[model samples]
Target: TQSHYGQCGGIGYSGPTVCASGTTCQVLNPYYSQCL
Candidate 1:
């Protein structure tokens, strides 16, 4: 899982899709999704 401010998902990102306990997946762009 991704931690706070970490990457969770995005276009082209095949990593973990889950975020930290208190964080959420936020898409900043088509290529970047972060755990905010």
Candidate 2:
């Protein structure tokens, strides 16, 4: 899927990176990061 990273000037991030297996993809304001 296509996603917008606002902190990176709305750049697109493509992935199958789902929140599972003790991991998560999170967005804060405009930034995106991975968390456990």
Candidate 3:
């Protein structure tokens, strides 16, 4: 989409992190890192 920022996964990124459509996955630390 290239609308903005996105990265629902964290720590190596195994899979299933959800955080694309729209955006909703903010952690930044302690695990599950995200950016929107």
Clashes of each: 0, 0, 0
Better of 2 and 3 by TM-score: 2
- Clashing pairs in model 1, backbone N/Cα/C closer than 3 A: none
What do the candidate models score in CA lDDT, each in turn? 0.89, 0.40, 0.61
Q: Order the candidates by lDDT, highest first — what do you get?
A: 1, 3, 2
lDDT assessment of candidate 3? 0.61
Model 3 lDDT tens row, 1-36: 222355566787676666667776776876556756
Which tens-of-lDDT digit does each residue in 1-36 have in candidate 1?
889999888788989989989889999898999898
Q: State, as a TM-score between 0 and 1, how close model 3 is to the true structure.
A: 0.28
Quantify how close model 3 is to the true structure by its C-alpha RMSD in Å.
6.2
Full-model lDDT, candidate 1? 0.89
Off by over 4 Å in 1: none
lDDT for residue 19 in candidate 2, whole number 0-100? 52
TM-score against truth, every candidate: 0.85, 0.31, 0.28
